[PDB]
Each structure stands twice: as C-alpha cells, then as structure tokens.
C-alpha cells in the first residue's frame, strides 16, 4: 500500500488518473507472460493486477476462465506464480502489484503464511474475490500484520452500510464495480475510503477519461487485455504490438 500511496500522490501532482491492466500469471506460458507484463509496464501501466490460476473461478467471466485454462495447460502452479512475482519486482521496484485471489488458495497453507509470502516477494495488495466484507476479518487482519493492503469490491447493488465497511476496512484502493457513480464516489470520499478505481468494463480510451472526470482515481481494465492475448495466440510478436498500442492509448486517455 505504501507504493499505492506514492503512486496516487504523483498522479495527483500531474492531474492524471491511473490505468491498471489485469492479466493471469502464466498465460499463455511462463516466459511469454513475463514478456507481456514487461510490455504493459513499458507502455505506461501505472500498476498491475495479477491473477493466480484457480480451478473453480466462481466470480469470473468466460474470458478469464479460458485464461486460467491456458495457464493450467502450461503447468503453472501457485509456487511458480510466486517465483514470477519475485522476478517482476526485481525488475520494476516501484510499480504497485496487486493479486486477485480465490479464498482457497489463500487458506490452503495458512492465511497468515500466505500474506507473509506476499510480503516477502514484494506484493502490495490482495483482493480475495469470494470473501465478502462480512467474512473478511481473518484475511484483512493477516494482511495488515504483513503490510499488505486488503482490497474490497464495492458492488453496484451496494448500500450505505456496505460503503462504510469498505471505506473502513480497505486500503490501497477501492475496487469499483443502484446508485449514480458520482454519488458513490463522493460517499466514499466522505467516509475517507482508499481512492476508487473504476473496474466495470473499461475497454476504450473514452471510458478511462469518463471515470477520471467522474471522480475516480483511475480505471482497471478487467478483461480487455486478456482478449488481445486470446486474439494473437499464434503470433507472439503481434500480441506484444497490439498490447503496446492499446495500453498506450488507454494511458494517454487518463491525463
């Protein structure tokens, strides 16, 4: 989260929103994934959100479901993901890195040991997709004891009581997924929530500028990046070029 604090202060000094791509670690192979991530960073991603492949992704659409299948096909395991994370951090010391996890991977070898391992490799935040705030106590407490920011999703069907808990329990940033956006953003500011990133279907440069103008501190591209991977599986060289052009367009749209 300290990396996140630094990130947002610099971006505010430039009147600039954050652009955060999501990819699955190890998709479509370990070596090509590391190249993808380096490409996204060189093209101006401000931070990363990275998924660890899980067998039963109960909160994921089909695009990400297939991404997990490719990674499994390539032999990716949780242990391999953590080696990848140490390598990414060694090469990019200042970029915030957030994990998107499912609870069983966190719980499997001990909740506290998982967050200890995140702290060791230099991960900044963890979002557990199937732990609602009502069940989050042992997870966020382990996160804080190891200086990991716990990320919570603030859903569309959110109400005021959820808003206060998300604002009070989360750190780093608030994952924004009814109620007019603008209100949601000012309510969260009222409760002193971590900066809100819009994450619902951000796929064109125009939505990025709309989110920042609406009060959001930036935007998370939840699946548009994974599609470009899926489109160009047969030509890794073309995959990278399409990724570099998309990301640099999205990043331009946030200034």
């Amino acid at each position: 989260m300290e990396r996140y604090e630094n990130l947002f202060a610099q971006l505010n000094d430039r009147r600039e929103g954050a652009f955060v791509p999501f990819v699955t670690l190890g998709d479509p192979g370990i070596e090509q994934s590391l190249k993808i991530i380096d490409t996204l960073i060189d093209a101006g991603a401000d931070a990363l959100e990275l998924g660890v492949p899980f067998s039963d992704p109960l909160a994921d659409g089909p695009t990400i479901q297939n991404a997990n299948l490719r990674a499994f096909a390539a032999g990716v395991t949780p242990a391999q993901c953590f080696e990848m994370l140490a390598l990414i951090r060694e090469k990019h010391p200042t970029i915030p890195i957030g994990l998107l996890m499912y609870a069983n991977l966190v719980f499997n070898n001990g909740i506290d040991a998982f967050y200890a391992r995140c702290e060791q490799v230099g991960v900044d935040s963890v979002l557990v997709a199937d732990v609602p705030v009502e069940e989050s106590a042992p997870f966020r407490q382990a996160a804080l004891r190891h200086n990991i920011a716990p990320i919570f999703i603030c859903p569309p069907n959110a109400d005021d009581d959820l808003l206060r808990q998300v604002a009070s329990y989360g750190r780093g940033y608030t994952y924004l997924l009814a109620l007019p956006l603008h209100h949601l953003i000012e309510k969260l500011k009222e409760y002193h929530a971590a900066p809100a990133l819009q994450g619902f279907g951000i796929s064109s440069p125009e939505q990025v500028s709309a989110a920042v103008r609406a009060g959001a501190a930036g935007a998370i591209s939840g699946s548009a990046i994974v599609k470009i991977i899926e489109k160009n599986l047969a030509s890794p060289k073309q995959m990278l070029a399409e990724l570099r052009s998309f990301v640099s367009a999205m990043k331009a749209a946030s200034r």
Binding site: D56, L58, A59, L69, F107, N108, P132, E134
Partner: protein, 395 residues
C-alpha cells in the same frame, strides 16, 4: 449481519463475491418468515401429500435378515414422485421463490436427477426454469435431458472449462448474480453458502420425522442406528435431523469409496479430504496439495460431489455421527441382493447405505440391532449401468 447462524462449529459460512450477498440475505429473511407462516406450511404439506406421495412407507426386510438378529427397515423415498428424495426440497424452494415474487428458477445438475426435480417443480408451479449442465454430462444422460425438455425446462449446455458440474454451477451462480431480482437459484444439496445448508435440511426433515413416528408405531422403540448415503448430504441430514437429540440413536453416513480409498479414485471428502473454501462454504473437500479442487469418483454419479455439507462435518467433529465408506463392488452386491430378495430395485446411491447395513449384520450376526436405511431413490435409472458391468464380468 444474518438472522441465523451461518456456521456449524467452524464449518459453513457465506464465501461468495460481495455482489451475491444481497441475494442470500433476502433469501434468509424470506425463509425465516415462511417458517413461521402456517399458511406456507399448509401449502407445502399439501403438495407433499397430494402431489409427491408423502408419507412414504417404512418397509421391513425379513427376507434379507433371515438367520441373524438384525431387524432392517427401509424408508421408501424410492416411492416418492420422481423416484428420489430430491422432490421434497425442490417443492419447498419453488414455493419459497413464488413467495418472494420470483418467476424464474436457475439450477445446475450433474447426473440429471436434480435437473429433473427442478423441472417438474417448475412445471407444476408455473415457473420458468433454466438448467445449466456440463456438456460431458449432457452426452452421458440423454434420458434425463429429454425428461427436462419434456417438462418445459431450458437446458443450457456449458462449453467451458472441464464441461462438468463445476462449469455449470459456476455459470449458474454467475447467472444468478445478474438475475436474482426475478430468479431464484435452486441449489440441489445441503451445501453451499448460507442459508442453503439450513433450508435444504428443513425441507428434507420430514423424512426423519415420519421415520421416527413410523418406527415407534411398528416396534415401540427408536432404532439403534439410521443409515444414509452422503453425497452433498441432503437425504442424510433429512433422515438425521429429528434424531440428533436422541443420543441413543446412532447416525451413520456412508460416502462412496469408489474403487477403494487407497487407489485415490473415490468420493469420501469427509473422511479423506482437507478443509478448504469452495462453493461458498468452508468444509472438508477433495483438493490437491496446492489447493485445486479434485473430482470425486463413484459408480454412482449421484454421489460425486467433491465436498460435503457443513452440518455433516460438524456432526463428525463432535462425535454425534459416524461416517464410513463403501466401495463400488460392495454397493453393486447390495443392489443385487435387494432386487433378488425383496423385489425392490434401489438406486446405486442408496445401495451404498444398504451395503453398510448388510456389513453390520453379517460381521456380527448374533448382535441384536434395529436398523433403518434411508432408501433415497429407485434404481431404474441405473439398470443399464448395472447391466453393462454385469456383462463385462460374465454374469
């Protein structure tokens, strides 16, 4: 904040994406209201009695126990409309959905029996019903798929992941997170996020309630043990619930042992699994060492749930109930034994429970004991499966 405790000791909970929590809370509240509403109970009881065939018989099996001191009864859920105990609770959930003002039913199914039960309940009550099913399971169960379509249900094949129950279940939850305003998700067993383990038990507990009254009438005493097979756990908890406070009554759950526990291909997570978090709950499950969810195996597709309901894990931990396993071969033999000596064709699921009873009788033939087996379904669905196996053995 819930009205009811979502945990059984340490097991259970509500481990779902935040977006789904309004749906579960709205469901818990409707259930608690419905439980207190005499009008709801009278409508439920009327459907069970005049449409499904309750109360089911309690059949004594003299032929099977001859030459021992075991007295054996079968609670005859094979006589229920639809041929299995699943009917009881889909009727409750379908009434609950109407009470909530919903008009669509979402369900998932593997072997197809919960698909059929969901479809017949939706047809009866005028609900629109869509059923997610793994494309590998669709191929293997064309009978049940046809049944579902005859009853007006939309069967949505899922071309994703492993094409098994998991992709459908996950697709059913995803569907529900968008549609819960108009749609109710009809979970098929006593597992999943709260309040489903509690609701499914309460809509199955008439099994044990009738069994208690019927055994008291016929023998004047409570049984020494009640025995039920355990997939996700709904028929067992339905049989068990009314006996839990009668501590002299043994409660015995039977999990599939497959080809054998030592071979690795089985379905006994309660006894050979590890606590994890999946499908909205914390429960014993079958998982790899780095925490991916494994498929369970059994000759009976109906027992292939890779976890178990959290109330069963709780009952095991405190020693109120005992859980054993029974192999494929033991189950087939019990299948043949019931056919030949009582004229009842049991489901291969229920054959696991019968097999354990036959073992208790045969290992100690001079032990006096009064046993009740929950015969959770009939085995017409298994006739081809059993035939092919018996042919492949020269029999």
């Amino acid at each position: 904040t819930t009205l009811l405790n979502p945990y059984f000791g340490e097991f259970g909970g509500m481990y779902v994406p935040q977006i789904l929590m309004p749906a579960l809370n709205q469901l818990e509240e409707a259930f608690v209201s419905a439980q207190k509403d005499p009008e709801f109970q009278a409508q439920f009881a009327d459907l069970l009695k005049n449409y499904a065939g309750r109360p089911t018989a309690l059949t004594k099996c003299q032929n099977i126990t001859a030459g021992t001191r075991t007295t054996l009864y079968l609670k005859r859920e094979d006589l229920l409309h639809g041929g299995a105990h699943k009917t009881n609770q889909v009727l409750g959930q379908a009434l609950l959905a109407k009470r909530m003002g919903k008009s669509e039913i979402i369900a998932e199914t593997g072997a197809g029996q919960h698909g059929v039960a969901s479809a017949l309940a939706s047809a009866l009550l005028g609900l629109k019903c869509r059923i997610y099913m793994g494309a590998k399971d669709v191929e293997r169960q064309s009978p049940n798929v046809f049944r579902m379509r005859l009853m007006g249900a939309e069967v949505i094949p899922v071309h994703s992941g492993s094409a098994t129950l998991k992709d459908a279940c996950n697709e059913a939850l995803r569907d529900w997170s968008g549609s819960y305003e108009t749609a109710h998700y009809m979970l098929g067993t006593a597992a999943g996020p709260h309040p489903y383990p509690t609701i499914v038990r309460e809509f199955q507990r008439m099994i044990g309630e009738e069994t208690k009254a019927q055994i008291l009438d016929k023998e004047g005493r409570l049984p020494d043990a009640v025995i039920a097979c355990v997939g996700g756990g709904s028929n067992a908890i339905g049989m068990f619930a009314d006996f839990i406070n009668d501590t002299s009554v043994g409660l015995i759950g039977v999990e599939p042992g497959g080809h054998g526990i030592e071979t690795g291909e089985h379905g006994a997570p309660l006894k050979h699994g590890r606590v994890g978090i999946y499908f909205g709950m914390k429960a014993p499950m079958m998982q790899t060492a780095d925490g991916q969810i494994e498929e369970s195996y059994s000759i009976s597709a109906g027992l292939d749930f890779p976890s178990v309901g959290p109330q069963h894990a709780y009952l095991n931990s405190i020693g109120r109930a005992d859980y054993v396993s029974i192999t494929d071969d033991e189950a087939l033999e019990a299948f043949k034994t019931l056919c030949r000596h009582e004229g009842i064709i049991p489901a291969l699921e229920s054959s696991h429970a019968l097999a354990h009873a036959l073992k208790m009788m045969r290992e100690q033939p001079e032990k006096e004991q009064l046993l009740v087996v929950n015969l959770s379904g009939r085995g017409d669905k298994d006739i081809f499966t059993v035939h092919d196996i018996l042919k492949a053995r020269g029999e």
